[PDB]
Design a protein around this ligand. Structure first.
Ligand SMILES: C[S@@+](CC[C@H](N)C(=O)[O-])C[C@H]1O[C@@H](n2cnc3c(N)ncnc32)[C@H](O)[C@@H]1O
Ligand SMILES: C[S@@+](CC[C@H](N)C(=O)[O-])C[C@H]1O[C@@H](n2cnc3c(N)ncnc32)[C@H](O)[C@@H]1O
Ligand code: SF4
Ligand code: SF4
Ligand code: SF4
Ligand code: SF4
Lengths: 327, 326
């Protein structure tokens, strides 16, 4: 009922990747040089079905998983995603379902998702200037379009948070504008340090604005209070406007790595297991295991075995290496 | 370059020079356990200064650039100035620091400075004379230790102060001590109290977290957060807005930092540890050296011992705490 990995960390979260497809080509994620005209995405039968995903989440819930995060790819591109939300809402032990999306398809699908039981979405939005944002997504999508999707989301009763990755020289001028826009909306925004591994190979700091450099900027424009963490090991450092009381947060992905409290497993779009959101090698093939014909007991024991041998700490590895590189 | 199992390099050596102390701090060397009848290490069971300088030179060749002198209370040793002069002549070694309760600073400060010591770290858990005396058990006033700090300062030593904050005991010293050392232009660091519970996770009942210290501080003082001087700096730094004096908060328990830990330790009885906390008796360096070994065999031993290190005690308790919040 509670499993711990090699670093003593219990399993609590499952990131479910539901597609490899996307409607953006963000330079730092799906650059069109790699994901271009001749890129071949997964054949449709090589994806996990919703029944397989729900079976997997069920057994994982038996081992202490309480939270499921739907991701991709752009998850709203997966047809009949509401069917998945509905099945996951039927599983005992699962307390929270979250969706990470660029938000473009929220007007199209949000109502379906809400009907099926979705209440929480995290919208990734890297700028609020239309020209800047278009140069980032490379699919001519205006920031203005996304803001309208966000307002529609809240209108139907979805709880919306916004996530922003700051790259020095690119969108670091977006911090103050985005803070003010969403402060007025009473929407929580999070800024995230850009993760980039150099040649050496700790962190590449050339495009990083750190949590602390970010916080020096903010303090010159706004009057703010540190918020004490809601719970032990809360990753995001929160602050609130004195106005007002609207909260925003800063994520120290690079300056202050947090693998020590990492309780997350991931399943890729092709149904392979990962104990870390980063991963250069193929994981155990959960998909082929399930499809070969197994009982729920055999599934559970393999899942348990996979967590117990887990020792992933990619970001902490990069941190130790950065320290060593400062020889 | 020499890295451990978690990819961490050696950069530091915590060097314990004595098992003796002139204080009896409740949470450290309680008077019960360490009473009159307690036999500390015989002089010849300690490492010689020559053994220590030899060990430090081998370590410098493997990456170490800082030595931190502790105990015990290091000023109970010996002709400490002689050790310091010898460590100061090792080229690989760029900084020597000393952790002290500060009591013997009028007695030994000058000769240590003359020997090459430039930085000291004075532990002082209370500024109030009564509360201090009941923490330390030896009737030493905070006023005494304060006066020692002003002496060390006047002879040229750079002084920082460390305060371990226990909720039911220390709590109310945060503001008086900040105010005092602010006028003095001395950096003070407040440290989260480290206690492990019956569940093997952190025990938060005596802990005042960095975050609740900061709430406290922002009511009485006007503060600027200070950007970390270098990557993986442990202490969180803040700056008084009027005179610019910095102070620090150390997240021992609320944000443990084993990932950037580059320290080896050597005990007063001459054992190696890869963690300032260790249940397992370390590699006996003393018996190894006294058996008759060359510098290369000593070097190959230290290198092997480091490469095999996977210590992460605080992170282990952090991960169990998360597992307990279950
Ligand atoms: C891979 S997308 C999947 C969900 C959806 N397509 C979206 O963009 O929100 C998930 C997140 O990964 C983040 N990401 C990818 N590369 C990153 C990097 N190098 N540094 C910080 N975040 C990164 C994106 O910014 C995005 O918020
Ligand atoms: C062992 S003493 C040695 C140097 C010198 N005798 C002194 O007290 O500064 C070093 C430090 O250990 C610290 N210490 C002992 N137990 C601790 C605990 N449970 N949590 C935080 N610090 C602790 C003391 O506060 C002291 O600053
Ligand atoms: S939208 Fe999300 S998944 Fe798509 S490229 Fe951008 S970040 Fe990546
Ligand atoms: S990098 Fe660390 S925190 Fe991030 S997913 Fe991997 S293990 Fe977890
Ligand atoms: S002074 Fe240092 S060594 Fe001595 S008992 Fe107190 S803390 Fe421990
Ligand atoms: S607990 Fe962590 S940081 Fe503290 S000394 Fe040990 S390994 Fe290093």
């Amino acid at each position: 009922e509670q499993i711990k990995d090699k670093l003593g960390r219990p399993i609590r979260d499952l990131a479910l990747s539901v597609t490899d497809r996307c409607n953006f080509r963000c330079d730092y994620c799906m650059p069109k040089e790699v994901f271009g005209d001749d890129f071949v995405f997964l054949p449709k039968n090589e994806l996990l079905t919703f029944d397989e995903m729900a079976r997997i989440a069920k057994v994982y819930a038996e081992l202490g998983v309480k939270k499921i995060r739907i991701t991709g790819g752009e998850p709203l591109m997966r047809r009949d995603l509401d069917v998945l939300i509905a099945k996951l809402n039927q599983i005992d032990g699962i307390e929270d379902i979250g969706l990470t999306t660029n938000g473009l398809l929220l007007k199209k699908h949000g109502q379906k998702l809400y009907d099926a039981g979705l209440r929480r979405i995290n919208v990734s939005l890297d700028a609020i200037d239309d020209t800047l944002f278009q140069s980032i997504n490379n699919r001519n999508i205006k920031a203005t379009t996304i803001l309208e999707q966000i307002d529609y989301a809240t209108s139907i009763g979805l709880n919306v948070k916004v996530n922003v990755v700051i790259q020095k020289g690119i969108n670091d001028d977006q911090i103050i504008p985005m803070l003010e826009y969403f402060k007025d909306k009473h929407i929580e925004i999070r800024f995230i340090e850009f993760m980039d591994v150099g040649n050496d190979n700790g962190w590449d700091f050339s495009k990083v604005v750190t949590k602390d450099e970010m916080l020096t900027m903010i303090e010159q424009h706004f009057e703010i209070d540190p918020v004490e963490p809601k719970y032990f090991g809360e990753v995001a450092k929160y602050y609130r406007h004195k106005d007002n009381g609207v909260q925003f947060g800063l994520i120290t992905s690079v300056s202050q790595s947090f693998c020590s409290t990492c309780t997350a497993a991931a399943l890729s779009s092709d149904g392979k297991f990962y104990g870390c959101l980063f991963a250069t090698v193929d994981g155990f093939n959960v998909k082929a295991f399930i499809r070969s014909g197994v009982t729920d007991e055999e599934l559970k024991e393999q899942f348990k075995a996979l967590w117990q041998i887990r020792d992933d700490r990619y970001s902490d590895e990069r941190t130790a290496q950065t320290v060593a590189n400062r020889q």
